[PDB]
Amino acid sequence: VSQVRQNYHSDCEAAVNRMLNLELYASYTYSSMYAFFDRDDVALHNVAEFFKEHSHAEREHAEKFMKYQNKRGGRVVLQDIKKPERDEWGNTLEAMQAALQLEKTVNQALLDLHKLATDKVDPHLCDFLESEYLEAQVKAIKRIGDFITNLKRLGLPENGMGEYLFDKHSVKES
Amino acid sequence: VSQVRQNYHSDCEAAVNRMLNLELYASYTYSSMYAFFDRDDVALHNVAEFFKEHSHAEREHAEKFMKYQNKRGGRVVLQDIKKPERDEWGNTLEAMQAALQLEKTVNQALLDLHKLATDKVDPHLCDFLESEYLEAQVKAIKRIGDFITNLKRLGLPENGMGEYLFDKHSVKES
Amino acid sequence: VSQVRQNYHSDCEAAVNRMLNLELYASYTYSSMYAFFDRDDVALHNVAEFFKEHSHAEREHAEKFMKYQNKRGGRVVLQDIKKPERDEWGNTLEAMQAALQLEKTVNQALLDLHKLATDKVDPHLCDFLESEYLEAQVKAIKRIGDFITNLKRLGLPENGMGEYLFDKHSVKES
Amino acid sequence: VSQVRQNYHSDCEAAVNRMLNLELYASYTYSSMYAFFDRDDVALHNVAEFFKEHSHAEREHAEKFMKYQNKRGGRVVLQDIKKPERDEWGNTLEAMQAALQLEKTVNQALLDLHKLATDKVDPHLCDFLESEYLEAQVKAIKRIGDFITNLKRLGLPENGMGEYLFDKHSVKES
Numbered sequence: 001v002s003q004v005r006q007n008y009h010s011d012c013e014a015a016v017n018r019m020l021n022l023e024l025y026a027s028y029t030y031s032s033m034y035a036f037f038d039r040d041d042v043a044l045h046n047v048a049e050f051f052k053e054h055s056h057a058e059r060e061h062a063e064k065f066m067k068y069q070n071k072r073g074g075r076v077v078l079q080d081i082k083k084p085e086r087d088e089w090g091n092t093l094e095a096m097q098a099a100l101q102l103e104k105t106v107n108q109a110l111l112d113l114h115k116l117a118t119d120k121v122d123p124h125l126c127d128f129l130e131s132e133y134l135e136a137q138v139k140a141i142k143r144i145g146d147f148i149t150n151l152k153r154l155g156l157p158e159n160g161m162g163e164y165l166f167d168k169h170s171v172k173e174s
Numbered sequence: 175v176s177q178v179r180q181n182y183h184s185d186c187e188a189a190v191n192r193m194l195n196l197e198l199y200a201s202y203t204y205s206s207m208y209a210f211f212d213r214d215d216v217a218l219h220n221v222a223e224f225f226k227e228h229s230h231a232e233r234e235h236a237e238k239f240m241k242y243q244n245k246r247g248g249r250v251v252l253q254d255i256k257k258p259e260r261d262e263w264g265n266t267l268e269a270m271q272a273a274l275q276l277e278k279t280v281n282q283a284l285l286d287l288h289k290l291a292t293d294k295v296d297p298h299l300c301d302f303l304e305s306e307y308l309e310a311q312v313k314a315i316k317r318i319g320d321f322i323t324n325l326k327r328l329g330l331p332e333n334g335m336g337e338y339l340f341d342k343h344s345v346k347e348s
Numbered sequence: 349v350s351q352v353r354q355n356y357h358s359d360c361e362a363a364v365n366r367m368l369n370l371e372l373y374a375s376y377t378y379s380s381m382y383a384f385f386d387r388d389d390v391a392l393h394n395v396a397e398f399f400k401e402h403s404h405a406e407r408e409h410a411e412k413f414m415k416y417q418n419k420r421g422g423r424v425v426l427q428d429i430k431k432p433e434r435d436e437w438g439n440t441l442e443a444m445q446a447a448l449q450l451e452k453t454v455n456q457a458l459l460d461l462h463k464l465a466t467d468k469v470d471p472h473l474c475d476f477l478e479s480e481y482l483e484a485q486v487k488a489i490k491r492i493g494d495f496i497t498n499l500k501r502l503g504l505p506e507n508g509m510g511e512y513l514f515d516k517h518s519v520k521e522s
Numbered sequence: 523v524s525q526v527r528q529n530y531h532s533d534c535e536a537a538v539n540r541m542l543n544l545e546l547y548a549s550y551t552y553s554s555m556y557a558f559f560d561r562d563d564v565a566l567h568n569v570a571e572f573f574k575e576h577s578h579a580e581r582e583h584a585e586k587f588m589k590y591q592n593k594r595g596g597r598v599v600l601q602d603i604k605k606p607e608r609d610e611w612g613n614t615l616e617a618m619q620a621a622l623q624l625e626k627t628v629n630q631a632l633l634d635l636h637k638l639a640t641d642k643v644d645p646h647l648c649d650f651l652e653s654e655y656l657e658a659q660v661k662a663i664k665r666i667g668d669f670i671t672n673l674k675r676l677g678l679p680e681n682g683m684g685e686y687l688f689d690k691h692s693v694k695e696s
């Protein structure tokens with residue numbers, strides 16, 4: 001038993017490791033999207049940079065779980081990071097739709113972890129999720145939903161001018 | 175009788191209270207428009223912020239009437255603030271058309287109050303309306319009319335790209 | 349269904365709209381108190397400004413619920429804002445007593461919303477209430493209770509000198 | 523006829539001279555109040571300074587009418603400045619009551635001048651009164667009414683402590 005461990009259930013420790021893997025999986029998916037939009041035959045560089053930044057944020061989410069695990073006296077256990085579901089991402093609308101789904105998947109995993117933490121009467125873990133993760137997910141989901149509404153307004157996937165304008169005006173200039 | 179009261183007709187006092195209610199009504203309508211454009215399935219954030227700012231301006235107009243009433247020795251009497259006419263606002267063109275109508279309605283109420291103040295030989299109230307309200311209405315009506323002309327130019331309501339571009343270029347970036 | 353919506357119960361969405369109305373109701377009550385203390389036959393201007401600021405804070409609380417509703421994919425539904433319970437507020441002690449009651453009423457509505465959010469297993473909504481609303485209410489209730497104790501110490505309602513001194517020393521100079 | 527004169531009725535010219543005299547009369551009354559509160563057996567120095575400043579403001583109002591008269595091509599005609607109605611002013615409450623009456627008397631003279639200017643179709647004179655005089659009177663009347671309400675609250679005329687506190691807290695420290 002770790003000398004620091006107190007009120008930390010084995011099931012929560014394991015669930016934190018699984019969540020860490022999912023954060024790294026999400027980071028790798030966003031890295032793939034970055035590389036796709038950087039292709040010479042895609043060439044939407046502000047969209048590419050949006051996904052690059054999302055990839056870095058997910059890696060930070062992962063690292064925060066590693067630090068959490070050690071703070072509670074659990075032990076980090078790593079597994080393979082599975083490659084993303086696609087090798088190419090179609091266009092800005094398809095990528096944003098995949099990102100929305102991924103953010104929802106990550107959100108559901110965090111909500112399920114909160115359920116477990118609640119069941120095991122772990123208020124520290126509940127607070128950590130509420131203060132560091134759940135609102136970040138709500139914000140990200142809203143941002144991507146707003147993007148999808150604008151992409152549809154701009155006539156994606158058919159309207160190339162619309163896609164060009166989204167890259168210039170809706171995502172940060174890089 | 176209030177110790178400060180001089181040359182202030184009961185009819186003007188009552189009309190000032192009614193005008194105060196109308197300013198608060200207009201504020202609430204613009205607040206509704208703000209919330210509509212902030213919806214994830216609408217997502218025109220500069221348009222949303224334009225209406226949020228209009229809502230705050232109307233609240234300031236209301237407060238200025240409250241202060242006026244007390245300065246003249248009248249008594250503020252409040253009534254329910256009726257909810258706006260619509261729960262959803264269609265699109266930027268429909269909202270701007272409703273805003274134009276509302277600004278005209280507010281303008282007519284101010285002009286009618288000026289008529290009453292004139293009839294009751296109240297030059298202080300005439301001056302207050304001319305100096306604090308009437309030109310603000312003319313300016314706002316012109317601004318919204320100019321917007322409507324541009325929205326029609328941009329192909330609203332059908333042209334989604336046009337609507338996107340209006341949000342980026344015609345209203346202040348927020 | 350909104351594309352952003354996840355783990356957000358219809359009952360919570362409706363309760364958020366009701367809470368929004370109550371915040372706007374509280375804002376309007378404090379606006380009425382402001383106008384009362386600004387009367388030439390009342391003339392307690394620091395008390396008036398205290399209530400004006402409280403009115404603006406409640407409007408901010410309302411706007412925060414509007415933004416929350418949209419972030420979760422719920423839909424803002426507005427109702428009439430009922431006029432305050434009184435047209436005149438007696439004196440500083442009666443107004444502070446009404447403010448204490450109102451802050452308790454708002455607090456109970458927030459606590460009831462937390463109960464509902466708990467029942468529907470919505471940790472994001474729980475966190476939002478805990479982090480943005482519940483402590484603000486506890487602070488406000490304590491501040492007003494402290495004021496009431498001082499008003500009674502100063503001999504309200506009979507002691508006019510006491511009431512004058514409260515305005516000069518207990519509320520911020522405006 | 524003055525080479526500059528245009529649309530300026532003889533009756534308005536005469537009424538401007540009478541108004542000038544009334545402004546100087548009001549200045550002299552406030553000067554008397556200043557000297558009274560500066561007496562060693564009165565000794566309310568912030569009250570004294572309030573009246574001194576009011577006296578200087580009235581002299582400025584007079585000078586503005588002199589300049590106006592010449593701008594329109596009328597001719598300044600001066601009359602004796604009558605001494606104030608009282609040689610001693612009782613206390614802060616009696617003086618403020620006399621000041622309220624005097625400000626109302628000045629206001630009525632300005633309103634009567636506006637009536638005359640209206641009758642003679644002189645929009646320049648109407649504007650001058652509205653922009654330079656009428657709101658100043660409304661503000662001053664409200665300020666003095668608020669003072670009287672506070673003086674009564676503080677137990678004037680009997681409550682000497684109340685009178686002392688008014689001088690310390692309600693008027694500007696000099």
Ligand SMILES: [Cl-]
Nearest residue numbers: 001002005073
């Ligand atoms: Cl352990």
Ligand SMILES: [Cl-]
Nearest residue numbers: 005006007008
């Ligand atoms: Cl343990």
Ligand SMILES: [Cl-]
Nearest residue numbers: 006007008121
């Ligand atoms: Cl425990």
Ligand SMILES: [Cl-]
Nearest residue numbers: 008009010011
């Ligand atoms: Cl365990």
Ligand SMILES: [Cl-]
Nearest residue numbers: 013014017077
């Ligand atoms: Cl594990």
Ligand SMILES: [Cl-]
Nearest residue numbers: 064068128132
């Ligand atoms: Cl942390």
Ligand SMILES: [Cl-]
Nearest residue numbers: 079080081082
């Ligand atoms: Cl596998």
Ligand SMILES: [Cl-]
Nearest residue numbers: 084085086098
């Ligand atoms: Cl996919």
Ligand SMILES: [Cl-]
Nearest residue numbers: 085086087088
């Ligand atoms: Cl693929």
Ligand SMILES: [Cl-]
Nearest residue numbers: 101102103105
């Ligand atoms: Cl997914």
Ligand SMILES: [Cl-]
Nearest residue numbers: 132133135136
């Ligand atoms: Cl968070």
Ligand SMILES: [Cl-]
Nearest residue numbers: 165168339342
């Ligand atoms: Cl452009």
Ligand SMILES: [Cl-]
Nearest residue numbers: 168169342343
């Ligand atoms: Cl541009």
Ligand SMILES: [Cl-]
Nearest residue numbers: 147150169170
């Ligand atoms: Cl956008």
Ligand SMILES: [Cl-]
Nearest residue numbers: 175176179247
């Ligand atoms: Cl009255």
Ligand SMILES: [Cl-]
Nearest residue numbers: 179180181182
């Ligand atoms: Cl009157």
